[PDB]
Each structure stands twice: as structure tokens, then as C-alpha cells.
């Protein structure tokens, strides 16, 4: 019923920044150098309160309320990151390059980085049912991001959460059918035809790794914690291998998946569950 389908949107929502949060504890520390995370403690190089998350979900969060104020707007998307990002103290150049030339689609070749991943969700939520989704993922990622397997890896991941929300069981998902044999960068293309079966050695801040280290967190999880677990234990860029690993997960598993102490300790969760019903309630109407 709409419960049930409601539970899939606030989960990959949610879910984003519930693994931002754990992941951030570990974010820079090499695999197996340190004691497994399994709860929200906080900590990290940035010394964030339990439940704090990064800029991974502070884009989704610029990228949702974009989304409801202005329906596809990149120029509006850059717009609030700019106004984030100066109010603060590749992505970077990216929004310079906006402020100089006005240039939404900011992101040049050397962006090859998991920042387009780590924001996805709310896009999915809201145009789930675009015929041009794919293409919409490929414009939101290349506000701050060029790279051929950046964008596809956007693709690809926008592909998942699609299915995912819609019912789509782990085998299909993990099956990535319409991608076998398409023209897409080699690196992906190793992920899509298996690379992710293998665990990775370390949590990987390029695209294509980034994805690959969440589909194997997915694959071996039986649940959204187990899963979320493996995907910060890897360390390195575990704040982004968590939000990936979060959003497919979360859309899988469902907000009643994901362990209510978690979600009781996430900052902001009463305001990130209104964007998701949000979103969703838009995906319905026009
Ligand atoms: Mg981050
Ligand atoms: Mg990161």
C-alpha cells in the first residue's frame, strides 16, 4: 500500500545520510586499521556529533529543496551549492567556474569523483517516472562533474534507484541487464559485468569504485545493517561509500529497515523525511 511505498522513498533518503554520518567516522583510514564502526558515535578527521553528516548530504539536501522550489533547475541546483559553499569555511573549481562564467554545467574531464553519487537520491524520488531520468542523472552530474565514467556511473546508479523503489528484487539490481554489453568506460564496465562481486581494499573516491564498493556492500549484506556495515569498514572514502550504499539500500530495505538508533541520533531527520514525501508526492502529480 502507500505505506509501503512511501517506506522505500524516505529510506534511499535517509539512508544517503544515515551512511554519510557512519561513514564520516572512518572517512581517510586505510581498511583494517581500525576496530569495526557499528554505531553512531561521531568522530572522524572533522570531529562531527553522533549522527552529523558531510557535504554529501548537504548537496541532496540543496539538490531536494531545488527540485521542489524549481523542478530541474542546475542553474538554481548551483546556485544554493554555490551560496553553501561560500558560506562555509574538483567540486570547488567546478562551482568557481559558475560564479565566473555562469555556466551551470560547471564540471570539466578531470571530475571523475563520487560527488554526483553521493547526491542522487532526491532526483530519483521526484522525476522516478521521467522517460528522460537517465539523462536528467547525466545534467545533475555534470554541474560539478565531466568525466565519461562519472556521469555514466550516475546513470547507472539513477538506473538502480529507479528499480529499487519500484520493487525490483537484489538479483535484478545487481544483474545491471540494460547496461551488459552497452558502450560505457572500461572501468564501469568491468563493475557492471562483475567487478563488484570482489570486496574492495579500500573505500575508493573515483566513480566507478565508489559504485562498485556499494553493489558489493548490497551483495553481501542481508539486511540494510549488515550491509552498511561493510560499507564503512572499508575506510578511505567512507562517508560516500555509505551515502552510495545507503540510498540503494535504503530504497531496498525500506526506512522501517534501517535501525531506528541510527535514525533517532541522524541530524536534521524530521526535515529530510519531509523533502523525501515531498519528492515522492511530486513524482506522483504532474
Ligand atoms: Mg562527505
Ligand atoms: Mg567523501
Sequence with gaps: GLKERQDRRLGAFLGLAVGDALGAQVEGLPKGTFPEVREMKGGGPHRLPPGF??????????????????????????????????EGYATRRALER???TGDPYAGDEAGAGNGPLMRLAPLVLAYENHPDLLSLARRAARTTHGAREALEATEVLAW??????????????????????????????????????????????????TLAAALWAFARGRDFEEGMRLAVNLGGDADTVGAVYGQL??????????????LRALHLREEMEALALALYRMSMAS
Design 249 to 262: 539500500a535504503g530504497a531496498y530495505y525500506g526506512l522501517g529497515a534501517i535501525p531506528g538508533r541510527w
Design 53 to 86: 553528516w558531510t557535504d554529501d548530504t548537504s548537496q541532496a539536501l540543496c539538490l531536494a529543496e531545488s527540485l521542489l522550489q524549481r523542478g530541474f533547475d542546475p542553474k538554481d541546483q548551483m546556485d544554493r551549492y554555490l551560496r553553501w559553499y561560500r
Design 160 to 209: 538502480l534507484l529507479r528499480e529499487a523503489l519500484r520493487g525490483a528484487p537484489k538479483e535484478a539490481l545487481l544483474a545491471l541487464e540494460p547496461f551488459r554489453g552497452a558502450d560505457l568506460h572500461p572501468a564501469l564496465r568491468r563493475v557492471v559485468e562483475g567487478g563488484f562481486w570482489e570486496a574492495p581494499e579500500e573505500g575508493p573516491g573515483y566513480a566507478p569504485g
Design 98 to 100: 559558475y560564479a565566473a
